[PDB]
């Protein structure tokens, strides 16, 4: 029974919504549960970054946005073949690899290659044995770095 100028409201309360009320009192406990597992995740991988593998430079679809640069699913194989890293070695070294990503442009390809090229420069690959095999790292590069990288590795600057 509307009276004197209200909006024609359509509340979606005609179902038995009281049986399916989702309370959010778990929010502070869920935040501690996620955080205490996040610190525990970072302590199992001692020298590895806490955020995980490297994400590529990715531009938005949906011309509404059309200019923002996101963190992608993974580096495509066409981007990996230019940089000279095999697709089954990039997963183990800490590079996100997906096979679905196409590469229609060219400037975006070199953006992802240059991201991967200078990533190998700052990467500290530990040897599998304590006696370092070929193409590892020198012992002088080890001792001045015993910390991870909080936040995403190489944060993407728009």
Partner 1 sequence: VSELAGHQTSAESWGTGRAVARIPRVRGGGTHRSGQGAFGNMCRGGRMFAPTKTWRRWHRRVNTTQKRYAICSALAASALPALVMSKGHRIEEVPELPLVVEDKVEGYKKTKEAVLLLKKLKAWNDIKKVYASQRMRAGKGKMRNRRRIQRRGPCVIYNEDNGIVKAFRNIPGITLLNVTKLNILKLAPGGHVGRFCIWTESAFRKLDDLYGTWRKAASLKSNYNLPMHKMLNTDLSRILKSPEIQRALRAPRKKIHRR
- Which residues form the interface with partner 1 (CB under 8 A)? 21, 23, 25
Nearest to 53 by CA among 147, 132, 123: 123
Q: Which of 48, 49, 101, 126 binds RNA (CB under 7 A)?
A: 101
Reported in sequence order, the residue ranges of the chain that DSSP labels E, i.e. its strands, are: 57-59, 69-71
Query: What single-letter DSSP state applies at residue 130?
Result: S
Number of residues that bind RNA (CB under 7 A): 82
Give me the residue label for tokens 């590795």: 153
β-strand partners of 54: 95
146 binds RNA (CB under 7 A): no
Q: Which of 48, 49, 83, 108 binds RNA (CB under 7 A)?
A: 108
Reported in sequence order, the residue ranges of 64-147 that DSSP labels E, i.e. its strands, are: 69-71
Q: Which of 104, 122, 143, 146 binds RNA (CB under 7 A)?
A: 104
Least distance between RNA and beta carbon 106 (Å): 8
16 binds RNA (CB under 7 A): yes
66 binds RNA (CB under 7 A): yes
Q: What is the rounded (10 degree) CA torsion for 13, 15, 16, 21? A: -50
Q: Which of RNA, partner 1, none binds 143 (CB below 5-8 Å, type-dependent)?
A: none
14 binds RNA (CB under 7 A): yes
């Amino acid at each position: 029974a509307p009276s004197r100028n209200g909006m024609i409201l359509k509340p979606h309360f005609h179902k038995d919504w009281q049986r399916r009320v989702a309370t959010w009192f778990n929010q502070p406990a869920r935040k501690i549960r996620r955080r205490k597992a996040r610190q525990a995740r970072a302590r199992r991988i001692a020298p590895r970054p806490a955020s995980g593998p490297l994400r590529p430079i990715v531009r938005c679809p949906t011309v509404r946005y059309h200019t923002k640069v996101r963190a992608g699913r993974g580096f495509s194989l066409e981007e990996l073949r230019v940089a000279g890293i095999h697709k089954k070695v990039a997963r183990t070294i800490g590079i996100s690899v997906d096979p679905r990503r196409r590469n229609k442009s060219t400037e975006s390809l070199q953006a992802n290659v240059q991201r991967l090229k200078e990533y190998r420069s700052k990467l500290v690959l530990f040897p599998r044995k304590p006696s370092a095999p070929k193409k590892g790292d020198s012992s002088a590069e080890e001792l001045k770095l015993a910390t991870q990288l909080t936040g995403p590795v190489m944060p993407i600057r728009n």
